[PDB]
């Protein structure tokens, strides 16, 4: 099994435009949305068919109730933060919690908050402490760290529960998440050489250019890995041609344990 992760994100907005939810919560397994909830629908619903097919209505009903509670808690926290920052207008509050199960069997776990899209509080589940970025966060840090049982609960959830959920969802979604679609790769000239890959899954891929057998990362332009819309991905990388000297240029692509080289004649 390659590396996989489970994450849940919350977004709260303090003064949203009409119709826009003040609260959204979305779960992911790897890059795949699995769940969604917001303050308009007030319902938690599957976002992947293999979640809908494997989790009974009592699962969605229970987490709907919990997310209604978490929505109210988030509004209270954001109200507190914006009053203590002495900020007017609309501001955002975000949370991310999750875990990774690495290919070698090791695990990671993480929990953090952001205000206006910047790190605000970051959990360290080994030292059982919160890292505060400023004095508003520092007041919250002190209150949360005075509740030792809740820190322990969060460490246990990140290390044990989260990973158990991830393995459960990974088996539900195995036909999607554990498949491999290899890339179709081509080179063309636009004066730079463009190495272009598409049709691949999972999205993790590494493309680079080597010149005479050496990799000069500073001379390479790396395109983003982008969703093609059909469940597969595409990516590219370019390198500039030297018109003064001949060189052997080759594109190198690594994807899901297979390496590919296309030499430019």
């Amino acid at each position, epitope marked *: 099994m390659r590396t996989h992760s489970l994450r849940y994100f919350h977004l709260g907005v303090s003064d949203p435009i009409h119709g826009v939810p003040e609260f959204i919560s979305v779960g992911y397994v790897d890059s795949h949305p699995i769940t969604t909830y917001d303050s308009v629908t007030r319902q938690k619903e599957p976002r992947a068919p293999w979640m809908a097919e494997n989790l009974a209505p009592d699962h969605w009903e*229970r*987490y709907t109730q919990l997310l*209604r*509670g*978490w*929505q109210q808690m988030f509004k209270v926290e954001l109200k507190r933060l914006q009053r203590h920052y002495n900020h007017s207008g609309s501001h955002t509050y975000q949370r991310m919690i999750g875990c990774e199960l690495l290919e070698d069997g090791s695990t990671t776990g993480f929990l953090q908050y952001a205000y206006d899209g910047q790190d605000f509080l970051i959990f360290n589940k080994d030292t059982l402490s919160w890292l505060a970025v400023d004095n508003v966060a520092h007041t919250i840090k002190q209150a949360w760290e005075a509740n030792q049982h809740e820190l322990l609960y969060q460490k246990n959830w990140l290390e044990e*529960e989260c990973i158990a959920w991830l393995k459960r969802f990974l088996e539900y979604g195995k036909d999607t998440l554990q498949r491999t679609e290899p890339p179709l790769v081509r080179v063309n000239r636009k004066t730079a050489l463009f190495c272009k890959a598409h049709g691949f899954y999972p999205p993790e891929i590494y493309m680079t250019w080597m010149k005479n057998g050496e990799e000069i990362v500073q001379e390479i332009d790396y395109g983003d890995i982008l969703p093609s819309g059909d469940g597969t991905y595409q990516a590219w990388a370019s390198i500039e041609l030297d018109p003064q000297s001949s060189n052997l240029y080759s594109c190198h692509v690594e994807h899901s344990g297979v390496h590919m080289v296309l030499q430019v004649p």
Partner: antibody
Amino acid sequence: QNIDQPTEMTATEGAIVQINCTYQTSGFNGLFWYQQHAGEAPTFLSYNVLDGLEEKGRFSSFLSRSKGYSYLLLKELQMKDSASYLCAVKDSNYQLIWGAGTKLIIKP
Amino acid sequence: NAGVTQTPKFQVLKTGQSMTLQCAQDMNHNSMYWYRQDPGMGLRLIYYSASEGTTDKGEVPNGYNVSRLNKREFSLRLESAAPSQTSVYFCASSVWTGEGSGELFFGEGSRLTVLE
């Protein structure tokens, strides 16, 4: 899913007693002990979620996650410790499963 | 600073009679619960209210309904009492639902006996 604890225990004033709770659950988000005097409300005693022992006055609570086991340890028993002791486990959906309680009887 | 206040302490009912149990908490808690306690078994949740403005069934909801009137109050209704509803009822509340380690605060109990 189930939680088990003995129906009743009897011990002598001044002695020590260990009340056992074992549990089989889908997932685990911590174990609580509550005290309930006869005719009265349950009151919170302790919470464990990682392995080990936590002390609180004359009471300590222990947890082994791999054995699915906890005990509530009462030292220097007093007559006022006569009460029921309720174990409860929070499962993977953050719902409590309650044991049926252990009635502790203290001989003066 | 009253904690959890539930009424009544005692009630006898005839089969088919209606009854409302009241519960209020002044601790600014978000989550409230109605439990029944019977001999030989653990507490069983009847209905709960994760926060103001939402409620849902627990493990034994049949024969009962609830109203989360506001943040402080969570009432339990037996529209048509039955002898199996003879029990001791406990209201409880917690700071919220997301506090994994958070404990319950219990009311004093309501002892109901339903007779033919």
